[PDB]
Amino acid sequence: QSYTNSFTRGVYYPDKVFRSSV
Amino acid sequence: LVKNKCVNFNFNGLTGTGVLTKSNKKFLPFQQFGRDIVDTTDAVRDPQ
Amino acid sequence: DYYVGYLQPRTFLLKYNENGTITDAVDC
Ligand SMILES: *[C@@H]1O[C@H](CO)[C@@H](O)[C@H](O)[C@H]1NC(C)=O
Protein backbone atom coordinates (compact mmCIF):
# COMPACT_ATOMS: atom_id res chain seq x y z
CA GLN A 1 0.00 0.00 0.00
CA SER A 2 0.88 3.71 -0.06
CA TYR A 3 -0.08 6.95 1.68
CA THR A 4 -2.05 9.80 0.10
CA ASN A 5 -4.00 12.89 1.17
CA SER A 6 -7.74 13.54 1.06
CA PHE A 7 -8.47 17.01 -0.29
CA THR A 8 -12.01 17.64 0.98
CA ARG A 9 -13.79 14.27 0.98
CA GLY A 10 -15.77 12.95 3.93
CA VAL A 11 -18.67 15.39 4.41
CA TYR A 12 -22.11 14.01 5.26
CA TYR A 13 -25.41 15.44 6.45
CA PRO A 14 -25.39 15.49 10.27
CA ASP A 15 -29.16 15.57 10.84
CA LYS A 16 -32.47 15.82 8.96
CA VAL A 17 -33.30 19.52 9.43
CA PHE A 18 -33.97 21.58 6.32
CA ARG A 19 -32.17 24.92 6.11
CA SER A 20 -32.09 27.56 3.38
CA SER A 21 -29.19 29.94 2.69
CA VAL A 22 -27.62 29.76 6.14
CA LEU B 1 -56.36 19.09 7.83
CA VAL B 2 -57.31 22.72 8.44
CA LYS B 3 -55.38 25.58 6.85
CA ASN B 4 -55.38 29.34 7.42
CA LYS B 5 -56.91 28.83 10.88
CA CYS B 6 -55.59 28.63 14.43
CA VAL B 7 -55.56 24.95 15.46
CA ASN B 8 -53.65 22.45 17.57
CA PHE B 9 -51.52 20.12 15.46
CA ASN B 10 -49.85 16.77 16.14
CA PHE B 11 -47.47 15.60 13.40
CA ASN B 12 -45.79 12.27 14.21
CA GLY B 13 -45.82 13.14 17.91
CA LEU B 14 -44.73 16.76 17.39
CA THR B 15 -47.33 18.96 19.10
CA GLY B 16 -47.84 22.70 18.88
CA THR B 17 -50.19 25.56 18.11
CA GLY B 18 -50.29 27.95 15.19
CA VAL B 19 -51.58 28.52 11.66
CA LEU B 20 -50.65 26.12 8.85
CA THR B 21 -50.17 27.77 5.45
CA LYS B 22 -48.69 26.71 2.14
CA SER B 23 -44.94 27.21 1.75
CA ASN B 24 -42.36 27.08 -1.03
CA LYS B 25 -39.33 25.67 0.80
CA LYS B 26 -37.91 22.53 -0.83
CA PHE B 27 -36.91 19.82 1.61
CA LEU B 28 -34.78 16.88 0.66
CA PRO B 29 -36.54 13.49 0.48
CA PHE B 30 -34.91 12.25 3.70
CA GLN B 31 -35.84 15.34 5.74
CA GLN B 32 -39.00 15.58 7.84
CA PHE B 33 -38.99 18.71 10.01
CA GLY B 34 -37.58 22.18 9.51
CA ARG B 35 -35.97 24.57 11.95
CA ASP B 36 -35.23 28.28 12.03
CA ILE B 37 -31.89 29.94 12.78
CA VAL B 38 -32.21 29.41 16.53
CA ASP B 39 -34.73 26.86 17.81
CA THR B 40 -38.23 27.20 16.35
CA THR B 41 -39.78 24.64 13.99
CA ASP B 42 -40.64 26.98 11.13
CA ALA B 43 -41.71 24.34 8.61
CA VAL B 44 -43.12 20.81 8.61
CA ARG B 45 -44.08 18.22 6.00
CA ASP B 46 -47.37 16.33 5.85
CA PRO B 47 -46.67 12.59 6.25
CA GLN B 48 -49.48 11.72 3.81
CA ASP C 1 -8.42 -0.03 -5.46
CA TYR C 2 -9.92 1.08 -2.15
CA TYR C 3 -8.99 3.62 0.51
CA VAL C 4 -9.42 3.67 4.30
CA GLY C 5 -9.57 6.64 6.65
CA TYR C 6 -10.39 7.41 10.26
CA LEU C 7 -12.47 10.13 11.90
CA GLN C 8 -11.75 12.55 14.73
CA PRO C 9 -13.93 14.98 16.68
CA ARG C 10 -13.78 18.39 15.05
CA THR C 11 -15.76 21.59 14.55
CA PHE C 12 -16.90 22.29 10.99
CA LEU C 13 -18.65 25.13 9.18
CA LEU C 14 -21.23 24.10 6.58
CA LYS C 15 -22.99 26.07 3.85
CA TYR C 16 -26.59 25.24 2.94
CA ASN C 17 -27.99 26.14 -0.48
CA GLU C 18 -31.36 27.84 -1.08
CA ASN C 19 -32.52 24.33 -1.86
CA GLY C 20 -31.19 22.30 1.07
CA THR C 21 -28.03 21.07 -0.58
CA ILE C 22 -24.63 21.30 1.08
CA THR C 23 -22.20 22.94 -1.34
CA ASP C 24 -19.07 23.80 0.67
CA ALA C 25 -17.47 23.15 4.06
CA VAL C 26 -14.70 24.87 6.03
CA ASP C 27 -12.57 23.31 8.75
CA CYS C 28 -11.84 25.09 12.02
C1 LIG D 1 -33.37 23.97 -6.16
O2 LIG D 1 -33.15 22.76 -6.88
C3 LIG D 1 -33.80 22.72 -8.17
C4 LIG D 1 -33.51 21.36 -8.75
O5 LIG D 1 -34.01 20.33 -7.92
C6 LIG D 1 -33.29 23.87 -9.04
O7 LIG D 1 -34.01 23.87 -10.27
C8 LIG D 1 -33.52 25.19 -8.32
O9 LIG D 1 -33.01 26.28 -9.09
C10 LIG D 1 -32.84 25.17 -6.95
N11 LIG D 1 -33.05 26.47 -6.36
C12 LIG D 1 -32.57 26.85 -5.17
C13 LIG D 1 -31.08 26.87 -5.05
O14 LIG D 1 -33.31 27.18 -4.25
Q: What residues does B10 pair with on adjacent strands? A: B15
Taking the centre of ligand 1 as the mean of its atom positions, its distance from the CA of residue B7, in whole angstroms, is 32
Termini Cα distance of chain C:
31
Say which of A4, A10, A18 has its CB closest to residue C20.
A18
Say which of C5, C17, C18 has its CB closest to residue A6.
C5
DSSP A1-22: ------SS------SSEE-S--
Q: Are strands B33-34 and C22-27 parallel, antiparallel or unpaired?
A: unpaired
Instruction: Report the structure determination method.
Output: cryo-EM
The residues, any chain, with a CB within 8 Å of residue B21's CB and separated by 6 or more, are B3, B4
What 3-state DSSP class applies to C16? Answer: strand
Q: In angstroms, what separates the C-alpha of A12 from chain C's closest C-alpha?
A: 9
**Contact in structure between C16 and A16 (CB atoms under 8 Å):** no
Query: Atom 7 of ligand 1 has which residue's CA nearest to it?
Result: C19
C17-22 — which CB contacts under 8 Å span 24+ positions? Answer: C17/A20, C17/A21, C18/A20, C18/A21, C19/A20, C19/B26, C19/B28, C20/A18, C20/A19, C20/A20, C20/B26, C20/B27, C20/B28, C20/B31, C21/B28, C22/A11, C22/A13
